[PDB]
């Protein structure tokens, strides 16, 4: 199994705390060094460091020699990670992996702990219509969509005329705006014939701010 | 800090094809003791990386023998004979032997197909937005393969930069394509200083640049 279990997902703002967990199964826990790496969202991978579990030491990778502290609970048969101070930059995924001697190799990974660091508050989005072309609307494929803008924390889920309409819907990935504001759009390619007869309607719903709107394009 | 350089960013391929992925250390990976660590994992969409092969050739327990593994000292490959729907996603080279462990930066497998240009669609700013101050402009490119593909705003004809977002879809399990959706953002006063709104796509599958437009504002 080797099974390890990390923490939920966390929500942070700069210079505060954080606190990862990281269980794994006993019987095995002394078997391995207990690392960690790090993944920015879209970015490579970081090894941070590992901790020893024979003997507790930890050893920090030049780069997170500072406000990491890598701890474990033998009883528990749990290890931690702790950053303090937190900045926008330590936004990231961050796996707890055991670790081989012989092989030195990295056998098991956590599922991944996120840590979200901002200061923005949670925020429900605007919705705003994408309206099909009008100056062009009978011309075979029809255009279509809703702009979800700036909203926080993430994320969003978006449906169309209450999850009936699927095939041609293509929802974007978010995109961090210079406001710290998350913003999104979701389209769907109709036939313009289906223009004037088949409503649409996209539905955006923001569970951290329990906002959810209807909005008919 | 040695340095593990994968040579195909991205990997187009086709199910039931072979696939070959290089990665190219700084230095060599033949650690003192004789043994040369060298790792290779794939890491799926929203999992865990997982360990595939150790140590330049070793199959990792439970990993499909289509997998395998070659290289001696700073130069590395990984092959997979008859590539599967469940072998696609991000593949990264690892390094045990000097100092501190570093990973390669990844390859992503993909599905290879057919080129297909892109479907554009432009859409101005709806006057709810704007009657808040802003306005933003979408540019949408539907379907479209390979992932390349350049979209150049234009204000009246002024070439636009620095004040656009763009998003790109995961590659279509359906089609293969992919989807992206460009947004111009500017002030609504900035924007209604403004005659001619358009985004010019240029696609490998597009004979010439296409360009959508409007014009109020």
């Known amino acids: 199994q080797v099974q390890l279990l990390e923490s939920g997902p966390e929500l942070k703002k700069p210079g505060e705390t954080v606190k990862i967990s990281c269980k794994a199964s006993?019987?095995?826990?002394?078997?391995?060094?207990m690392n960690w790496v790090k993944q920015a969202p879209g970015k490579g991978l970081k090894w941070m460091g590992w901790?020893?579990?024979?003997?507790?030491?930890?050893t920090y990778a030049d780069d997170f020699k500072g406000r990491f502290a890598f701890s474990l609970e033998t009883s528990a048969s749990t290890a931690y990670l702790q950053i303090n101070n937190l900045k926008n930059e330590d936004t990231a995924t961050y796996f707890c992996?055991?670790?081989?001697?012989?092989?030195?190799?990295?056998?098991?990974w956590g599922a991944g702990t996120t840590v979200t660091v901002s200061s923005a508050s949670t925020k429900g989005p605007s919705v705003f219509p994408l309206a099909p072309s009008s100056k062009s609307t009978s011309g075979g494929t029809a255009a279509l969509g809703c702009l979800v803008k700036d909203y926080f924390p993430e994320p969003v889920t978006v449906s169309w005329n209450s999850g009936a309409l699927t095939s041609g819907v293509h929802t974007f990935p978010a995109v961090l705006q210079s406001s710290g504001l998350y913003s999104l759009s979701s389209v769907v390619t109709v036939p313009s014939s289906s223009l004037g007869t088949q409503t649409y309607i996209c539905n955006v719903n923001h569970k951290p701010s329990n906002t959810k709107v209807d909005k008919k394009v | 800090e040695l340095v593990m350089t994968q040579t195909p960013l991205s990997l187009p391929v086709s199910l039931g094809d072979q696939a070959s992925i290089s990665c190219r250390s700084s230095?060599?990976?033949?650690?003192?003791?004789?043994?040369?660590?060298l790792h290779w994992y794939l890491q799926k969409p929203g999992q865990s990386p997982k360990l595939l092969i150790y140590?330049?050739?070793n199959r990792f327990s439970g990993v499909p023998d289509r997998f395998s593994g070659s290289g001696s000292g700073t130069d590395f490959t990984l092959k997979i004979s008859r590539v599967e729907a469940e072998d696609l996603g991000v593949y990264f080279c690892?390094?045990?032997?000097?100092?501190?462990?570093?990973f390669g930066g990844g390859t992503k497998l993909e599905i290879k197909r057919t080129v297909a240009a892109p479907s554009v669609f432009i859409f101005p700013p709806s006057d709810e937005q704007l009657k808040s101050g802003t306005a933003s402009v979408v540019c949408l490119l539907n379907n479209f393969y390979p992932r390349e593909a350049k979209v150049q705003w234009k204000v009246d004809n002024a070439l636009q930069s620095g004040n656009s977002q763009e998003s790109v879809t995961e590659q279509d399990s359906k089609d293969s394509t992919y989807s992206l959706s460009s947004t111009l953002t500017l002030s609504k006063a900035d924007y209604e200083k403004h005659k001619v709104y358009a985004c010019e796509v240029t696609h490998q599958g597009l004979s010439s640049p296409v360009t959508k437009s409007f014009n109020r504002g």
């Open positions: 006993g019987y095995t826990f002394t078997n391995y060094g």
């Open positions: 992996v055991q670790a081989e001697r012989l092989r030195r190799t990295f056998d098991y």
């Open positions: 230095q060599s990976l033949v650690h003192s003791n004789g043994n040369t660590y």
């Open positions: 901790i020893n579990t024979y003997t507790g030491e930890p």
């Open positions: 690892s390094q045990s032997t000097h100092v501190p462990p570093t």
């Open positions: 140590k330049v050739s």
